[PDB]
Amino acid sequence: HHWGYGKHNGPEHWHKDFPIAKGERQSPVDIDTHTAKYDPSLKPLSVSYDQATSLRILNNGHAFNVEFDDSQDKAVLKGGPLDGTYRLIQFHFHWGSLDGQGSEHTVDKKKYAAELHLVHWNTKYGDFGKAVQQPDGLAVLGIFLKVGSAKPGLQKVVDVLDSIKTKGKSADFTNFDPRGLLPESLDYWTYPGSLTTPPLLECVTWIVLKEPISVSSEQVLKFRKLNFNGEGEPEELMVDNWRPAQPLKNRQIKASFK
Ligand SMILES: NS(=O)(=O)c1ccc2oc(NC(=O)c3ccccc3)nc2c1
Numbered sequence: 001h002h003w004g005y006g007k008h009n010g011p012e013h014w015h016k017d018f019p020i021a022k023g024e025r026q027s028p029v030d031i032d033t034h035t036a037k038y039d040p041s042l043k044p045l046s047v048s049y050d051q052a053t054s055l056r057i058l059n060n061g062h063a064f065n066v067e068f069d070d071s072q073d074k075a076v077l078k079g080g081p082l083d084g085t086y087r088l089i090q091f092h093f094h095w096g097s098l099d100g101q102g103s104e105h106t107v108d109k110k111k112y113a114a115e116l117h118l119v120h121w122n123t124k125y126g127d128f129g130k131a132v133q134q135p136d137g138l139a140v141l142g143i144f145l146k147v148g149s150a151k152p153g154l155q156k157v158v159d160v161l162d163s164i165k166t167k168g169k170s171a172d173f174t175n176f177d178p179r180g181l182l183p184e185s186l187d188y189w190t191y192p193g194s195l196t197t198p199p200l201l202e203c204v205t206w207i208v209l210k211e212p213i214s215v216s217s218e219q220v221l222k223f224r225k226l227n228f229n230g231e232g233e234p235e236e237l238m239v240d241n242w243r244p245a246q247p248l249k250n251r252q253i254k255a256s257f258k
């Protein structure tokens, strides 16, 4: 399986190995702000990251993941559209070659410079691998990044990137507090969708925050020094690792706010 984000192996090719690429609940999507409806039945969103235990940061050849210890209920997402408890397992980003593109979701067709995904699995299924086989198995909290002032809570991540430049490299990454990546408001849009990379499984409740975070140009420029390739291989900068918006089909995007 040699999928990626080049001309020869990018998102337009993925359907050949992963037919669900052309499925009925694929992600990301465009969020039309004038079509999404406020839903008063949405319960309040509860982001409880006080006991989060980060462990490691990994360049997987597609992005970099900050991995958490999820062997107990240490950092959980609840409320909003969700039933039950969803446990934080990792976060990562998608970003562009230029500030004008990079996000996977769009807002009225606007692309942001990047998009953070905090990935959580539904604890009624016991483990992540079982959760991804269920329509309600994962909740991904998506947060847009725009370029402006620096995000201080991001800098520990930025400064470790030098040590994981190439595919397969990892570093110790303990005591990182993901609350420093959140915007002030938790206002959100929600819809049923998928993983945005292969295997493209249709197992995700998407919760996309309306308020972006600001990061500095220097911060995002460091993301773009990463490599898709392994050590000693020809250098391919890790940029433009985003899937474009997919058909909405028979779905409704709900707003948590008036
Ligand atoms: N862009 S996305 O839709 O948020 C997205 C896309 C693809 C993903 O594959 C994984 N797997 C694990 O984290 C994992 C965790 C435990 C064991 C194996 C894998 N999370 C993903 C999130």
Ligand SMILES: [Zn+2]
Binding pocket: 092, 093, 094, 117, 196
């Ligand atoms: Zn993602």
